[PDB]
């Protein structure tokens, strides 16, 4: 918690709470200037609650006095915390205007609304007059700058607490909060700036949940020693496909090759295996003889033999989901002593007891529907539920990659959030590519967690590099964009 970090910074380091509050407010002023240009032509409406978020607002309002066209504070609380009171007091000594009633037509006379109503740790549903004011600000068309978190977002979850401010700019302090990172909060945050307000860098660094950044991914990318050969860069087996789903294997395989893997082999039911090499002849696509077009226990021994000469096995994309696939998948993973990347239909039939028993590592890559089915909960209970994902990862000894617009990657100890990507990834085939990427990076020497971190980022970044409208992005185009994402990362 930043709440804890503020407390330690005040109580143990001895920084006056007022100094933190001053730094917070001036950082909002500087951020607005960076975004709007010269502030002197704008009229500012500052909405202050009674808490320290409001206190930060009074500092903003006071620092705009005499410099901008007009400033008014509407004070919406009933009582003020000590730092809010002190800064209210300064704003008034400096000649500032405060009113305590919100008049709908007051929005008419201002260009920018500074939302300092509620901050982090707000827990209750907003109703009554706070709601009305927030709804009026949202309909007003004005530029909205939110102090810390848009008022009405739960800063621990990203949920809207009945209603919430939609900001053009949010200025937060120290670190991004979970509510900036997860949706809907991420959407309501608008452009996010993270200000340094003077916390010791050691406390800022102690946070155990992180946003995955370019710099983090660049320092995890494996080295490519010049004197190398394909085995230097690992070997992947991908067990995938069926008579129903012949495309999945192809997309996973190329996903491994595009991130620099040395050798990729697919095991796919004949004749669907032939689809992959007609499209990308650099793939090895082994024909697996099946009774009805789906993997079954009769293919167990062939798949374990194929496994011996690879570094990692991805399983699941397009396998189908029937009882014989279920038997095969669970018996295979129980016997495979290689890292496993488990996706799609391998998740749908997975017996989670098998994961506890494995000595080798695993990465699971469910979307929330798949996660929901796996732990027997509703999609709504699991979506963006990073604590559930952490517990699952810790209990089953795996890395969990819970896919959504913000993807969560956790091994139960460390949790990372991915924010790259766009809606073109919301389309069949996208996940199959990511599964290949993750396997590939594990094969090249990254840990399951590192492989997942780099892969989710690059998969999202590749999507963003599509030249045309994102809704026209397809998995095949995404594959083409991977090596550009890699080059841009460096």
């Amino acid at each position: 918690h930043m709440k804890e970090i503020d407390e330690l910074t005040i109580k143990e380091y001895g920084v006056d709470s007022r100094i933190l509050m001053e730094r917070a407010g001036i950082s909002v002023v500087l951020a607005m200037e960076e975004e709007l240009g010269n502030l002197s032509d704008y009229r500012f409406l500052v909405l202050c609650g009674g808490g320290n978020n409001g206190g930060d607002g009074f500092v903003v309002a006071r620092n705009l006095l005499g410099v901008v066209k007009d400033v008014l504070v509407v004070f919406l609380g009933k009582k003020k915390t000590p730092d809010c009171e002190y800064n209210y007091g300064l704003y008034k000594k400096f000649g500032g205007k405060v009113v305590e009633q919100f008049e709908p037509s007051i929005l008419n006379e201002f260009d920018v609304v500074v939302d300092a109503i509620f901050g982090t740790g707000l827990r209750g549903e907003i109703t009554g007059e706070y709601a009305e004011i927030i709804n009026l600000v949202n309909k007003s068309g004005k530029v909205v700058v939110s102090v810390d978190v848009p008022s009405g977002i739960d800063s621990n979850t990203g949920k809207v607490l009945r209603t919430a401010v939609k900001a053009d700019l949010t200025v937060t302090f120290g670190v991004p909060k979970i509510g900036h990172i997860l949706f809907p909060g991420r959407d309501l945050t608008g452009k996010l700036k993270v200000a340094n307000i003077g916390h010791p860098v050691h406390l800022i660094n102690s946070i155990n949940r992180y946003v995955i950044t370019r710099e983090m991914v660049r320092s995890l990318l494996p080295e490519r020693p010049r004197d190398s050969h394909k085995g230097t860069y690992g070997k992947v087996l991908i067990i995938a496909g069926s008579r129903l789903y012949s495309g999945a294997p192809v997309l996973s395989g190329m996903g491994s090759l595009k991130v620099g893997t040395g050798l990729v082999k697919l095991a796919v039911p004949f004749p669907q295996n032939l689809i992959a090499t007609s499209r990308f002849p650099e793939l090895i696509s082994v024909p697996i003889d099946t009774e009805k077009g789906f993997f079954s226990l009769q293919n167990l021994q062939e798949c374990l033999e194929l496994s011996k000469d690879v570094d990692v096995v991805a399983i699941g994309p397009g396998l189908g989901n029937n009882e014989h696939v279920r038997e095969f998948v669970n018996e295979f993973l129980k016997t495979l002593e290689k890292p496993a990347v488990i996706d799609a239909d391998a998740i749908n039939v997975l017996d989670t007891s098998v994961l506890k028993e494995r000595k080798s590592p695993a990465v699971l890559t469910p979307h929330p529907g798949e996660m929901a089915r796996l732990v027997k909960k509703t999609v709504g209970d699991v979506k963006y539920n990073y604590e559930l994902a952490e517990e699952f990862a810790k209990e089953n000894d795996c890395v969990l990659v819970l896919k959504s617009a913000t993807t969560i990657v956790t091994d139960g100890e460390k949790t990372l959030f991915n924010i790259t990507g766009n809606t073109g990834l919301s389309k069949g085939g996208s996940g199959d590519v990511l599964t290949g990427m993750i396997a590939g990076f594990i094969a090249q020497g990254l840990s399951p967690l590192e492989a997942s971190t780099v892969s989710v980022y690059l998969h999202g970044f590749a999507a963003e590099l599509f030249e045309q409208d994102e809704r026209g992005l397809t998995a095949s185009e995404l594959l083409r964009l991977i090596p550009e994402a890699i080059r841009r990362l460096k």
């Binding site: 700036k193 993270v194 200000a195």
Partner: peptide, 6 residues
């Protein structure tokens, strides 16, 4: 970069 991460 001293003041803002963006």
């Amino acid at each position: 970069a001293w003041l803002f991460e963006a």
